[PDB]
Scaffold this active site. Structure first.
Site, PDB file in Angstrom:
ATOM      1  CD  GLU A  35      49.020 -54.040-100.504  1.00 22.01           C
ATOM      2  OE1 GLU A  35      47.881 -53.891-100.998  1.00 22.01           O
ATOM      3  OE2 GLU A  35      49.198 -54.008 -99.264  1.00 22.01           O
ATOM      4  CG  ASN A  46      40.221 -48.609 -99.832  1.00 17.34           C
ATOM      5  OD1 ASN A  46      41.043 -47.754-100.196  1.00 17.34           O
ATOM      6  ND2 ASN A  46      40.467 -49.891 -99.886  1.00 17.34           N
ATOM      7  CG  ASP A  48      38.031 -44.475 -96.921  1.00 21.08           C
ATOM      8  OD1 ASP A  48      38.110 -44.993 -98.042  1.00 21.08           O
ATOM      9  OD2 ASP A  48      39.020 -43.960 -96.356  1.00 21.08           O
ATOM     10  CB  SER A  50      40.131 -43.733-100.291  1.00 16.05           C
ATOM     11  OG  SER A  50      40.185 -44.941 -99.520  1.00 16.05           O
ATOM     12  CG  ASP A  52      43.914 -49.113-101.709  1.00 17.82           C
ATOM     13  OD1 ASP A  52      44.042 -48.012-101.137  1.00 17.82           O
ATOM     14  OD2 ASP A  52      43.553 -50.135-101.112  1.00 17.82           O
ATOM     15  CG  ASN A  59      43.869 -44.899 -99.524  1.00 18.89           C
ATOM     16  OD1 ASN A  59      43.581 -43.837 -99.004  1.00 18.89           O
ATOM     17  ND2 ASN A  59      42.978 -45.813 -99.794  1.00 18.89           N
ATOM     18  CG  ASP A 101      53.615 -40.468 -93.082  1.00 20.76           C
ATOM     19  OD1 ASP A 101      53.962 -39.281 -93.250  1.00 20.76           O
ATOM     20  OD2 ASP A 101      52.467 -40.799 -92.693  1.00 20.76           O
TER      21      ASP A 101
END
EC number: 3.2.1.17
Length: 129
Positions: A35, A46, A48, A50, A52, A59, A101
């Site tokens: 990562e 990203n 969208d 957002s 990271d 995120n 989650d």
């Protein structure tokens, strides 16, 4: 900070990640390698809107507040800038929330694509121990 492989493994172990929700330490070290290349200051934006953040590329759509992701939650209750610290405590604590989650480590795309199903114990081989 750019961690060494064994240095990070030791820091993760100390922070309770070994076997957390059944994921052995090598999984976490493999996920961090792919990562962020073990760099706590890594950021990536990203499509969208957002971003990271940090060693585990957490995120801002869901997990931290960066003041510039309109649709968003802050489930970890932290500024995203905290995830960039040389001290990985904030990242680890938030990662524990993520992995619980419902989708496990599949939340991390690089883990699913590059670590899942591979010999992940190789990532902690040679480390003390």
């Amino acid at each position: 900070k750019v961690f060494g492989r064994c240095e990070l493994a030791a820091a993760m172990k100390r922070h309770g990640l070994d076997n957390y929700r059944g994921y052995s330490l090598g999984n976490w070290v493999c996920a961090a390698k792919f990562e962020s290349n073990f760099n706590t200051q890594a950021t990536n934006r990203n499509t969208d809107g957002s971003t990271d953040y940090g060693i585990l590329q957490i995120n801002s759509r869901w997990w931290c507040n960066d003041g510039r992701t309109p649709g968003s939650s802050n489930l970890c209750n932290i500024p995203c800038s905290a995830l960039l610290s040389s001290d990985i405590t904030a990242s680890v604590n938030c990662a524990k929330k993520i992995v619980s989650d419902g989708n496990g480590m599949n939340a991390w795309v690089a883990w699913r694509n590059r670590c899942k199903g591979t010999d992940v114990q190789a990532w902690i081989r040679g480390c003390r121990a």
